[PDB]
Design a protein around this ligand. Structure first.
Ligand SMILES: Nc1nc2c(ncn2[C@@H]2O[C@H](COP(=O)(O)OP(=O)(O)OP(=O)(O)O)[C@@H](O)[C@H]2O)c(=O)[nH]1
Ligand SMILES: Nc1nc2c(ncn2[C@@H]2O[C@H](COP(=O)(O)OP(=O)(O)OP(O)(O)=S)[C@@H](O)[C@H]2O)c(=O)[nH]1
Ligand SMILES: Nc1nc2c(ncn2[C@@H]2O[C@H](COP(=O)(O)OP(=O)(O)OP(O)(O)=S)[C@@H](O)[C@H]2O)c(=O)[nH]1
Lengths: 426, 422, 426
C-alpha cells in the first residue's frame, strides 16, 4: 500500500540513498541481508511501503540506482548492506557527463532514459499502489541534475497525478566546486519549476556548519551529512510508515506547503541535535526543541529566514507527550515570532505527530517550513549566471551537446519571474 | 395506424440507423430476414410474414453501405433503400452540400416521397447524422430544407453527432458545424446532443467498461430513440406524440436544441447491485455527470423537463418524485416557465440485446430537457471558429467548391445572435 | 473503388515503391507471385485499391515504373516480388539525365512523357474510380525531379479534381551529393507550389540518425529507410484500405492539412520504433507513443519544429484501445506543448483510428503534422541557390537544354514568397 519508489542520481545521491536504506533497516528491524528481527509489530506492519515481498521471509528496498559511472556503484554495493539490493536495480553508464547538465541529459542520458523508465515502471506495476516518488541528486553536479530533470519530466508525462518530492542538493554559495555548476542549477531549476510538485532545498555549508558547531565535531565528514539526511528521511516518512494519533503522509504535507504551483521550494529541518555531554545535561522536553525549531544555527539551506518571511510551517513529532502542549507552544511561537512570520496566513503551523520515535531517540523533530529566504539564494544564482554568461565563457561544452542561446535566456527569465513572485509575496 | 420515416446520412448516421433497426427488430422478434400492429410504425406489411424498415441509407462514401449490405441482415433490408456514393466530402460541408449532394439529393427526396406515399399516417421524420462528417453536415442540411419545402409543417426530428469540445475527428469541424447550424436553424424542429467523450466517460465509470467500442455508442443512440419512440410503438397511461415534443420545448423558434439523457446505464453484475426506484433513478439522471452532455446544466437555467417512463411505473410515485425534485435548490427554472413538466408513461419495459452493455430491466426513464449550458458549448465553438478563421485557414477548400468568405462570416454572426439570445 | 495509381521516378523512388509493394503484399496476404493467402476477409475485401482483377485468382499492383536507365529496372525486376508486375508497366529510357532537371524534363522527358501519360491513362480508365495518385521521387536527383514535375503538371492539366500526394525526397542539407542538386530542388519546388495539392518532405539525414540512434543500428542501410518509408505508406493508406471505427482517406487528410493552396508541405511520422531488447521491456501503451509523437529524435524532415510553430497535427492509430484515452492524450499534448503549438488553431489535432494493425505490430502510429520548421530548410535552400547562382557556375548544362535566366529568377522569387508567407504565419 502507498508504495514509494526511490531513485538516486549522482555519487552523492547514491550515498544518501544507501545511508537512508541502512537507517530504514534500523527503524524497521531489518538486518544487513534483509531478514526481519524487529521486536514490535509496528516496524513490520507497514514494511511494504519501502520493501517488496521477497521469498524466504526477506525484504528488499524499493530503490533504483542510476549513475553514469560504476565507481560509486561498486563502493555502494561492496559497502554495508550491499546484499539487500538485487543486482538488477543497479544500472550504470560508462562515459560520465563530467559535471555537465547537457551531456548527462542528452548525450549519455539518451541511452539511460530507457533503462530508468523501464525499472521505474517495473517498480510501479509490481506494487499495489504507488503513492509517490522520492529522488535524491545534486544540483551542483552536472549528470545528477540531468537525471533528475529527465526523471521528473518522464514521471510528469507518465504519472501526472502521483505527487512526489525531490531532495536535490543545491551547490554551496561559498564554494565553487564546479565552474559550470551555475548552468547545472539553472537548468535543473528551470525543469523543477515545471516537472516537480514540491522540492526541498538542501545546501552544503549550512549542514557543514551544523556539524561543526551544533554537533561540536572538529572533523565533519560526508557520513554525518548522510546521517542527518537520513534523519530527515525518517522524519518526513514516519507518519506514513508508522501509526500515529495524527496520521499524515506526503500528500498532506504537499497540500499544506504549496500555495502556488511555482511556489514549491522548502527548506527541511531536524532536531534535537546534541552531543554526549550535552544530552545528559540538556532538557529532553518540548521547549528545548521549540527554541531549536526556529534558529539560524540549526538551519538547513543557507539563507536566513529572518531577513524574509515564513510562508507556513509544518512540524512532525515522534514521542510520548500531549498534544495541547504542542498547540500552546505553536501559539507562543506565533506570539513571539510574529514579525518573522506572515501576517496574512494565520495559524500557519502544520501540526502532526507520529507515535513511534526513531531508534535510539525517544524524540525526533523534523521542521518543514517555507520562507522567502530562498529568494536571496535564487537572486544570487541569477546574478552569477548573468555575470559569467555575459562573458560567454564555457558555453562551448553545452553548445556541443545541442544547446542554444535563447533557451538559457528563457531559463534565466523563468528564475527572474520566480524571484519576482517570491519578492511580491514578501 | 401510423408510420414514421428514419433518415441516415454519413458513416455515423448509417451506423446509428443500423443499430436502431437492430433494436426495432429484436424488440419485435424480427429474424434477420423479416419474419416471426404497433410494429407497422416502422415496418410494412406485404405478402406473408414480411417486414422491411422504412428508412433510406445514403452516404457520399460506399464503405458503410457496403458494410451494412454484408451483414446477416441483408435479407432484412431492401437493397434499393441503400444508396452508395462515390466522392466523400471528407469533412467538408460545402463539398457534400454542393459538389456531390446536389446531383444525388433527387433520388432520395424522390423515393422517401414514396415512403410517405404508402404511409398515410406519417407522424414525422427521423434524421441521424454527424456535424463533424462533411456528408453528415452538408447532405443532411440540404435534405432537411428539401423536407421542409416538400412537406411544409410536417414534424421532423434530428439526431446529430455534435463533435465534443476536445474530441474532433477533423480540425475543420468548426466550419462544418457552424455552416450546417446556420443553414438548418430555421427548419430544425428539434436537434439533440451526442457527446462522444461523455459517452466514453459514462461507459467507463457507470458500466465500468474499460475498453468500450462504438457498439456501446450505437445502442446509446438506440436506447435513446427507443425510449423516445416507445409512446408511438406502444400504448401507455399518457402517450406522447412527436408534435407535443416540439410544442413544449419550442415556444420560440430560435431555441430548439434540447439535450438528452438516459437512466440507467448499468451492467448485469451491477444490475444485481441496484434495482430501480423512481426517486433514486430520477435524481441520479438529473445529476450533471450522468448526462451524456459535456456541459454542466447548473451553470444556467432550465427551460423545461420531460419524463419518459417505460414499464411498471406508478404515476403517483412519478408525481411525488418529480415534486421532491422540484423543491431542492440544485434545480432552478426560468421565471416565466414555472410549469414546464410533461410526463409520458409507457407499459413496455425497455428491451435488451444479447451480449450488450445494458442489463435487461423492466423499467426505465428518459431524461429530456433544454438547459442553458448548451450556450456554453455554442460560445466555445464560436470562439474556436473565430480563432481558427481569424487567419482564414482551410477556407480555400470551401472556396474551391465556389464561394467566397462572406456566408462564413454572416453564419458566424447568426450563431452569435443565437448565442446571445439566451 | 477509390483506386490509386503508383508512379515511381528515379532509382530511389523505384526501390521505395518496390519495398512498398512487398509490404502491401504482406499486409494484404499476397505471396511473391500474386496469389492471395490472407487469413482474414479484411485483407482481401479492399484489395482492388492497389491491385487489379487478374485472371487465375491473382492480383497485380497498380504501379507505374519510370526511369531513364534500365540498371535499377533489372535489379528491381530480378529482385524479390519481381514477377508480380507485368512487363508493360516497366518503361525506361536509354540516356539518363545525369542528375539534371532540365535534361530529364525536356531532352529525355520529351520521349517519355507520351509513354507515362499513356500508362497512367490506361491505369485510370481500366479502374472503376481513381481516388487519387501517389508519386515517389528524389528532389536531389535531376531526372527523378523532372519526371515528378512533368507528371504532376500533366495530372493537374488532365485530372484537376483528383487530389494526390507526392512523397518527394529532399536532398540532405549536411551532404552535397550532387553539385547541381540545388537547381533540381529549385525547379521541383517551383513546380510543386503549382502542380501538387499536398506534399510530404522526406529528408535523408533525419531518417539516417533515427536508424543510427532510435533503432540502435551500427550499419544503417537503404533497406531500413525503405522499410520506414513503407511503414509511412501503410500508416497513411490503412484508413482507406482497411475498415475503421473512424474511417478516413487521403481526401480527409488533405482537407485537414491544407489551409492555403501554397501552404501544403508536411513532414510525415511513424511510431513506435524500438529494438528487440527494448520492445520486450518498453510499455506497449499509448503514453509511450505520445511521448514519441512529438520529439526531435524520431523526427522525419530535418528541421526542428520547436523553433517554429505547428500548423496542425494528424494522428492515425491501428490497434485495440478506446477512443477517449486518445482524446485526453491529445488534450494533454496541447496543454503541455502550447508554446510549441499555434494559439489560433484550437484543437488542431486530427484524430482517426484504423481498426486493423499492421502485420507484426499490434500498434503502429503515423504522425502527420505541419510546422513552420520547413521555413528554415526552404530559406537555407534559397540562400544556397543565391550563393552559387551569383557566381553563375554550372549554368551551361541547363542553358544547353533550353533554359533562361529570369526563369530561375521567378523560381527563386516564388520560394522567397513561400518562405515569407510561412514566416508571416509564424
Ligand atoms: N457517436 C458516434 N459517432 C460516430 C460513430 N461513427 C462515426 N461517428 C462520427 O463521425 C465522425 C467522423 O467523420 P464521418 O461522419 O464518419 O465523416 P464521413 O462519413 O467520412 O463523411 P465525410 O466527412 O463527408 O467524408 C466522428 O467525428 C464521429 O462523431 C459512432 O459509431 N458513434
Ligand atoms: N552531503 C553530501 N554531499 C556530497 C557527498 N558526495 C558529494 N557531495 C557533494 O556533491 C557535489 C558534487 O556532486 P556530484 O554528484 O558528485 O556531481 P556529479 O555530476 O555526479 O559528478 P560526476 O559523476 O559527473 S563525476 C560536491 O559539491 C560535493 O560536496 C556526500 O556524500 N554527502
Ligand atoms: N532512402 C533512400 N534514399 C536513396 C536510395 N537510393 C538513393 N537514395 C538517395 O537519393 C539521392 C540520389 O537520387 P537519385 O534518384 O539516385 O538521382 P537520379 O537523378 O535518379 O540519378 P540518375 O538516374 O540520373 S543517375 C542520393 O542522395 C541518395 O542518398 C534508397 O534506396 N533509399
Amino acid at each position: 500500500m502507498r508504495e514509494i519508489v526511490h531513485i538516486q542520481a549522482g555519487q552523492c545521491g547514491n550515498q544518501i540513498g544507501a545511508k537512508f536504506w541502512e537507517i530504514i533497516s534500523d527503524e524497521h528491524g531489518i538486518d544487513a541481508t534483509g531478514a526481519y528481527h524487529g521486536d514490535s509489530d509496528l516496524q513490520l506492519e507497514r514494511i511494504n511501503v519501502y520493501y517488496n515481498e521477497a521469498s524466504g521471509g526477506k525484504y528488499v528496498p524499493r530503490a533504483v540506482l542510476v549513475d553514469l559511472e560504476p565507481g560509486t556503484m561498486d563502493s555502494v554495493r561492496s559497502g554495508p548492506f550491499g546484499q539487500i539490493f538485487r543486482p538488477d536495480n543497479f544500472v550504470f553508464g560508462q562515459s560520465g557527463a563530467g559535471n555537465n547538465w547537457a551531456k548527462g541529459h542528452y548525450t549519455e542520458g539518451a541511452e539511460l532514459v530507457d533503462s530508468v523508465l523501464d525499472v521505474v515502471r517495473k517498480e510501479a506495476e509490481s506494487c499495489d499502489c504507488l503513492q509517490g516518488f522520492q529522488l535524491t541528486h545534486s544540483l551542483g553536479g552536472g549528470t545528477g541534475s540531468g537525471m533528475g530533470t529527465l526523471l521528473i519530466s518522464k514521471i510528469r508525462e507518465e504519472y501526472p497525478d502521483r505527487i512526489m518530492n525531490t531532495y536535490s542538493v543545491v551547490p554551496s554559495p561559498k564554494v565553487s566546486d564546479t565552474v559550470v555548476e551555475p548552468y547545472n542549477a539553472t537548468l535543473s531549476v528551470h525543469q523543477l519549476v515545471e516537472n516537480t510538485d514540491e522540492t526541498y532545498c538542501i545546501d552544503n555549508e549550512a549542514l557543514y556548519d551544523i556539524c561543526f558547531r551544533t554537533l561540536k565535531l572538529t572533523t565533519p565528514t560526508y557520513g554525518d551529512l548522510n546521517h542527518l539526511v537520513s534523519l530527515t528521511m525518517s522524519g518526513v516518512t514516519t507518519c506514513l510508515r508508522f501509526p500515529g494519533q495524527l496520521n499524515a503522509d506526503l500528500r498532506k504535507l504537499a497540500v499544506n506547503m504549496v500555495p502556488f504551483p511555482r511556489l514549491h521550494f522548502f527548506m527541511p529541518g531536524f532536531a534535537p541535535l546534541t552531543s554526549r555531554g550535552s544530552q545528559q545535561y540538556r532538557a529532553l522536553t518540548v521547549p528545548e526543541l521549540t527554541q531549536q525549531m526556529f534558529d539560524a544555527k540549526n538551519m538547513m539551506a543557507a539563507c536566513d529566514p529572518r531577513h524574509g518571511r515564513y510562508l507556513t510551517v509544518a512540524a512532525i513529532f515522534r514521542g510520548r507527550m500531549s498534544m495541547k502542549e504542542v498547540d500552546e507552544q505553536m501559539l507562543n511561537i506565533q506570539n513571539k515570532n510574529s514579525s518573522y512570520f506572515v501576517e496574512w496566513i494565520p495559524n500557519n503551523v502544520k501540526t502532526a505527530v507520529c507515535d513511534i520515535p526513531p531508534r535510539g531517540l525517544k524524540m525526533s523533530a523534523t521542521f518543514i517550513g517555507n520562507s522567502t529566504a530562498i529568494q536571496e539564494l535564487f537572486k544570487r544564482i541569477s546574478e552569477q549566471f548573468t555575470a559569467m554568461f555575459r562573458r560567454k565563457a564555457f558555453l562551448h561544452w553545452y553548445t556541443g551537446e545541442g544547446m542554444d542561446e535563447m533557451e538559457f535566456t528563457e531559463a534565466e527569465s523563468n528564475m527572474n519571474d520566480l524571484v519576482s513572485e517570491y519578492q511580491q509575496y514578501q | 395506424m401510423r408510420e414514421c420515416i428514419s433518415i441516415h446520412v454519413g458513416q455515423a448516421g448509417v451506423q446509428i440507423g443500423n443499430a436502431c433497426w437492430e433494436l426495432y427488430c429484436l424488440e419485435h422478434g424480427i429474424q434477420p430476414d423479416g419474419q416471426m400492429d404497433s410494429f407497422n410504425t416502422f415496418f410494412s406489411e406485404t405478402g406473408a410474414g414480411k417486414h422491411v424498415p422504412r428508412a433510406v441509407f445514403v452516404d457520399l462514401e460506399p464503405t458503410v453501405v457496403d458494410e451494412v449490405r454484408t451483414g446477416t441482415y441483408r435479407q432484412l433490408f431492401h437493397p434499393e433503400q441503400l444508396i452508395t456514393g462515390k466522392e466523400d466530402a471528407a469533412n467538408n460541408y460545402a463539398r457534400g452540400h454542393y459538389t456531390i449532394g446536389k446531383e444525388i439529393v433527387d433520388l432520395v427526396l424522390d423515393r422517401i416521397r414514396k415512403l410517405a406515399d404508402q404511409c398515410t399516417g406519417l407522424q414525422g421524420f427521423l434524421i441521424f447524422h454527424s456535424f463533424g462528417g462533411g456528408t453528415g453536415s452538408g447532405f443532411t442540411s440540404l435534405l432537411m430544407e428539401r423536407l421542409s419545402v416538400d412537406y411544409g409543417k410536417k414534424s421532423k426530428l434530428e439526431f446529430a453527432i455534435y463533435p465534443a469540445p476536445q474530441v474532433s475527428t477533423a480540425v475543420v469541424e468548426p466550419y462544418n458545424s457552424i455552416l450546417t447550424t446556420h443553414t438548418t436553424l430555421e427548419h430544425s424542429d428539434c436537434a439533440f446532443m451526442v457527446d462522444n467523450e461523455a459517452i466514453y466517460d459514462i461507459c467507463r465509470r457507470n458500466l465500468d467498461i474499460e475498453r468500450p467500442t462504438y457498439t456501446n455508442l450505437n445502442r446509446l443512440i438506440g436506447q435513446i430513440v427507443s425510449s423516445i419512440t416507445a409512446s408511438l410503438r406502444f400504448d401507455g397511461a399518457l402517450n406522447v406524440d412527436l408534435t407535443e415534443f416540439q410544442t413544449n420545448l419550442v415556444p420560440y423558434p430560435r431555441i430548439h436544441f434540447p439535450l438528452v439523457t438516459y437512466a440507467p446505464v448499468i451492467s448485469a453484475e451491477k444490475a444485481y447491485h441496484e434495482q430501480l426506484s423512481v426517486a433514486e433513478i430520477t435524481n441520479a439522471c438529473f445529476e450533471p455527470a450522468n448526462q451524456m452532455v459535456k456541459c454542466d446544466p447548473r451553470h444556467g437555467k432550465y427551460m423545461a423537463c420531460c419524463m419518459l417512463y417505460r414499464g411498471d411505473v406508478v404515476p403517483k410515485d412519478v408525481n411525488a418524485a418529480i415534486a421532491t425534485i422540484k423543491t431542492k435548490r440544485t434545480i432552478q427554472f426560468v421565471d416565466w416557465c414555472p410549469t414546464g413538466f410533461k410526463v409520458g408513461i409507457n407499459y413496455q419495459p425497455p428491451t435488451v440485446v444479447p451480449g450488450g452493455d445494458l442489463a435487461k430491466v423492466q423499467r426505465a426513464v428518459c431524461m429530456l430537457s433544454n438547459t442553458t449550458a448548451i450556450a456554453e458549448a455554442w460560445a466555445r465553438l464560436d470562439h474556436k471558429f473565430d480563432l481558427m478563421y481569424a487567419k482564414r485557414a482551410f477556407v480555400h477548400w470551401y472556396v474551391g467548391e465556389g464561394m467566397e468568405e462572406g456566408e462564413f462570416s454572416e453564419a458566424r454572426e447568426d450563431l452569435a445572435a443565437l448565442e446571445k439570445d439566451y
